[PDB]
């Protein structure tokens, strides 16, 4: 899925719009743009793709009271991620001995 | 916006579908359904409404490398929420004195 | 762990301080106070016990440079969580028919 | 706070344990170890210092029942955060034209 970058050139973003010059099927080139506002969204600070997943990922739906939809929904897949923390923030040398402060 | 429940009756959820009998403008009633799969979505276990907000809430967009969009995006508005924690989890009586363990 | 409330009586909270009258091991009672501010955190609106134990879920720890701890850590395990959404936010009665607006 | 690395040398990490050779206040050096497992936590894949200080952002604390601390706490303050998304996930070159797929 996707992978435009493998056959497009001079790609650029300006505001919400992606522009690039892409190889046509039969050897030519074409410059075109796509407005990302219609395909990505900001959820609490993090960009994600827009789509539907409610049927795919939720279960045991109920109506509570007059208008509350309640359900059980599956959280994101687990992965390993690289992380770091600076030990100098809280680890001190206290007369020759390492101590948290 | 919304507020169907103020003029609809016998609302129910089955799977992803909401069904209700609503007052018509000129006095009658009508039973109709709406499939919530096209209007809500599960983000990391939490239900939200689908929609677009990229232009509304993000800034300083850039293309890093061949295909990474980088931006700065506004997080959710701050509010106060009611919360509880059971002090019996960790607070002990140690011979007459309250101690964390 | 904990369970002070099984042998302590007439507890009170004032700000971050818990006070109670607790049974002594050998008879009699003692009144004491504990400032919970040093052991409870506010995480995005929820009270939570101060946490640690990173090594249970992190691998390949290394020192980077003079002071940085670097590792590969697991994100939250995938599970089903309870979630709710108020359908009155966006579902309307439009002349007898339920519509997203 | 902290800053052990300014006056400690030849530091090493093994598992959750930091080891270093540190200057003593009056001359000379001492070697010591500190288990970081009791003060650092894995929060959704990021290493974080053990946190507390709930009262700075919570109000109206009260004791509910015999052992429940109840309050109203602020969620994360609204800010702009940096975020990124790989457009190669879903943007394709479709015969010379950029399209979502």
At a glance:
The structure is a homotetramer of 101-residue chains. The first copy, chain A, is mainly beta. Chain A has one helix and ten strands.
List the helices and strands and how they pair.
Four copies of one chain form a homotetramer.
Chain A lengths: L7 E7 L2 E7 L5 E7 L4 E4 L2 E4 L4 H4 E7 L3 E7 L5 E7 L4 E4 L2 E4 L1
Antiparallel strand pairs in A: 1-2, 2-3, 4-5, 6-7, 9-10
User: Helical segment tally of chain A?
Assistant: 1
SSE-based structural type of chain A: mainly beta
Specify which chain pair forms the largest interface. Answer: B-C, 50 and 50 residues
Beta-sheet strand percentage of chain A?
Answer: over 45%
Number of strands of chain A: 10
Helix content of chain A: under 10%
* Quaternary organisation: homotetramer
What is the global morphology of chain A? flat
Spatial extent as radius of gyration of chain A: 24 Å
How many structural domains of chain A?
1
Biggest β-sheet of chain A, characterized? 3 strands, antiparallel
Main sheet: strand order of chain A: 1-2-3
Order of helices and strands of chain A: EEEEEHEEEEE
Distance between the ends of chain A = 50 Å
Keywords:
mainly beta, three-stranded antiparallel sheet, sugar binding protein, CVNH fold, carbohydrate binding protein, antiviral protein
Structure write-up:
4 copies of one chain form a homotetramer. Chain A has one helix spanning 54-57, and strands spanning 8-14, 17-23, 29-35, 40-43, 46-49, 58-64, 68-74, 80-86, 91-94, 97-100. By secondary structure, chain A is mainly β. Chain A has a 3-stranded antiparallel β-sheet, with no helix packed on it. In chain A, strands 4-5 form a two-stranded antiparallel sheet. In chain A, strands 6-7 form a two-stranded antiparallel ribbon. In chain A, strand 1 and strand 2 (17-23) form a beta hairpin. At the B-C interface, strand 2, strand 3, strand 5, strand 8 and strand 9 of B face strand 2, strand 3, strand 5, strand 8 and strand 9 of C. It is classed as sugar binding protein.
């Amino acid at each position: 899925l996707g992978k435009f970058s493998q056959t497009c050139y001079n790609s650029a973003i300006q505001g919400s719009v992606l522009t690039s010059t892409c190889e046509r099927t039969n050897g030519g080139y074409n410059t075109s743009s796509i407005d990302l506002n219609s395909v990505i969204e900001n959820v609490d600070g993090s960009l994600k793709w827009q789509g539907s997943n409610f049927i795919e990922t939720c279960r045991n739906t109920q109506l509570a009271g007059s208008s509350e939809l309640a359900a059980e929904c599956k959280t994101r897949a687990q992965q390993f991620v690289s992380t770091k923390i600076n030990l100098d923030d809280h680890i001190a040398n206290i007369d020759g001995t390492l101590k948290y402060e």
